[PDB]
Amino acid sequence: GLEDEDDDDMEQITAQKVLEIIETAWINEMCAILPSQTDMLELMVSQVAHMEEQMRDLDKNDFRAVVHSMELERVRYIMASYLRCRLQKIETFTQHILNQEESREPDDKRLSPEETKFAQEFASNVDEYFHKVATQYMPNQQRGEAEQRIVTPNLMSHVFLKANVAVPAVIVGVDDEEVDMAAGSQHIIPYQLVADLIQNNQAQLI
């Protein structure tokens, strides 16, 4: 019903624009899961497929063949990079992330299913290889998926802030001093305190 946005809608979201509309979801994931979308699995594989079939039509040219190709490549090593990162993020954070999932069942905004199939793949490999590490006389009281194991409770990725908001001191949520904001300068912090502006995407990252 509510069409006519710059998303994949009844209009042209340019390949160079659509370049942008997913760019920051990658550039944030460096300096820290942030909320993930399976929507791009509808977007990219569709849009690129249309040009792919267009190139599959235009596979006779020399030039525009190659231009669309180099385009595709420059698009694609980042789409590599996303899960090239996230697999590490939760292969790391296989430990206590399930707490967050049993707290909130995080919706299409936050997590995605295949990540939660890594829960299967994790417990399978770990316990069925542990099945030959120490299971002859395995533990007595802490016998399950153990208590003490965590990758990253540190919400403390101390982070540079891309000032691109209200150049007056727009004072917002952070547990350290927040006085004197502006569109260029910064008061550098860790991730623990602003889980707020980037869930808003009020603020930004360098």
Binding site: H158, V179, G184, I188
Partner: peptide, 23 residues
């Protein structure tokens, strides 16, 4: 001084050269 820093007319190509280390 977490709450003191400088971007006001920083460029693009520099901050990476301290990005990995001090933080």
């Amino acid at each position: 001084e977490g709450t003191y820093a400088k971007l006001d007319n920083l460029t693009l190509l520099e901050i990476h050269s301290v990005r990995p280390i001090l933080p």
